Design a binder for this molecule. Structure first.
Ligand SMILES: OC[C@@]1(O)OC[C@@H](O)[C@@H](O)[C@H]1O
Ligand SMILES: OC[C@@]1(O)OC[C@@H](O)[C@@H](O)[C@H]1O
Lengths: 282, 285
């Protein structure tokens, strides 16, 4: 009963939390859980799945792959049950978080917090992110939706196109800080990995107070929650996503179904109880 | 060429970065890397490897397991190449960090930083953590060595014994906050997993002043580095540990050898490059 979870990286705070949740859920099913990395490379993702098929894994969870179709064909040729997690696929059923709604409540929350510091203008509210993923594009849509309702206007240049990688995000923060002289008063970071780019930027500018900023991040991390600026985070319901990923694998419907799970807004300085219960007891 | 890394949990920041480093090195070796968790339970650790053996895994990295010897006996029956990482085992080769020395330099750094705010007394310097773990005992020893050298005295009553668990650590900070009315000016947190307990404690006491603190944590995380209070972190050279872990897998020498890798002290507000390079550049399909 070997079941595999395919993730882009182990180092990611969201995917690392998913792997912990996945292992426990698989353990309760009596399955044996293994995690493999696709390294966000379609060829690597295909080779990794082929290796898992060669080693006779029973089921695969496909989480955050850049190419869902190529992975599906490999699983289909091997007749290996697979469900998409987090990022949708057309051929197989997908369980994903409600990125648009999560971004909307996140943007509304950081807008309300920043406004307590002083009235805002649309040029004050910026998103660092990208169009490469359905989740990322959905996040910009929720972000624009909350801004449009708040300001009553839309269509400003509020998107700083940054790559999921922190280095491109760091350069964006460096570039923005260069013309404006400050960080935006209210800004949205697309991912926890993007958030690392902000820290790289901040480390380069020791001696800057960065006191006027309010930040909203997709993905949750207790350490990021307690950062010296107020940080609002969206925590996806990974457990429900995996629970639906399971049971969807049991079920034989050929028709692909996309199931959307509502995320939860996390206020600043919140340290939540984690998936590891009594694992770290002596 | 399936090569496995066995970790206690996926969620831990040290083990998650280790899995990232392990994935890259294994890929360069032309191996196929996969990670499994032992949940710090000896029976599940052994049962997990037994299953990997049944599926004919080629090599295994044993990282932070509660029962290194029992895992070794399981590997030995299958003649499966294995090296212990981070936590030593007597029967198989181990690559471990220099926990005692890293703890010593960590304590010296936070002592120096805390002292710059005001003279210290030995009761101001506390450690939250400690475990039957070899790393934990070595860390407590390095902590005591640095305190004794600084103060010129020892036998202070400065170790708050907690499991790795955040909840027990949170209770430890809570009890300390009850007696003192504040957090200690200088304290050492054994693990990044313990560190969550400190955040849980702070979250429980919103609007309450904890006092001015300097914190040293073993293990490194960029977010934890940038916490509003100064956090000094020890970063183990995970890349070297795994490189030494490989090739130790290649060698057929029966004799167990423990290789000690020096960790690096990280000052507050430091963001590293990490083990992920180019992975997050856009694919555009
Ligand atoms: O940090 C995790 C992340 O960047 O991964 C890629 C996206 O699918 C989404 O899960 C996002 O949260
Ligand atoms: O979180 C990692 C850690 O705290 O766990 C206990 C030890 O294995 C040691 O590696 C230490 O780094």
């Amino acid at each position: 009963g070997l079941v595999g979870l395919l993730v882009p990286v182990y180092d990611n705070r969201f995917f690392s939390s998913m792997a912990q949740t996945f292992e426990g859920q698989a353990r309760k099913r009596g399955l044996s859980p293994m995690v493999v990395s696709g390294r966000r490379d379609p060829e690597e993702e295909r080779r990794t799945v082929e290796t898992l098929i060669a080693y006779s894994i029973d089921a695969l969870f496909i989480a955050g792959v850049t190419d869902p179709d190529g992975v599906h064909q490999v699983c289909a040729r091997a007749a290996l049950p697979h469900v998409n997690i987090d990022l949708p696929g057309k051929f197989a059923s997908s369980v994903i978080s409600n990125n648009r709604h999560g971004a909307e409540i996140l943007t509304a929350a950081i807008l309300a917090h920043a406004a307590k510091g002083g009235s805002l203008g649309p040029d004050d509210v910026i998103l660092f992110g990208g169009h490469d993923d359905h989740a990322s594009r959905e996040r910009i849509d929720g972000f624009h939706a909350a801004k449009a309702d708040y300001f009553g206007v839309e269509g400003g240049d509020d998107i700083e196109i940054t790559g999921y990688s922190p280095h491109m995000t760091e350069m964006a923060f460096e570039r923005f800080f260069g013309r404006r002289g400050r960080l935006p008063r209210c800004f949205f970071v697309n991912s926890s990995i993007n958030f690392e780019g902000l820290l790289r930027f901040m480390g380069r500018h020791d001696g800057e107070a960065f006191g006027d900023i309010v930040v909203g991040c997709f993905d949750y991390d207790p350490f990021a929650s307690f950062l010296p600026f107020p940080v609002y985070m969206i925590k996806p319901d990974i457990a429900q996503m995996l629970e639906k990923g399971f049971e969807l694998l049991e079920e034989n419907r050929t028709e692909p179904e996309v199931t959307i799970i509502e995320p939860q807004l996390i206020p600043p300085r919140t340290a939540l109880e984690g998936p590891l219960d009594d694992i770290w007891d002596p």
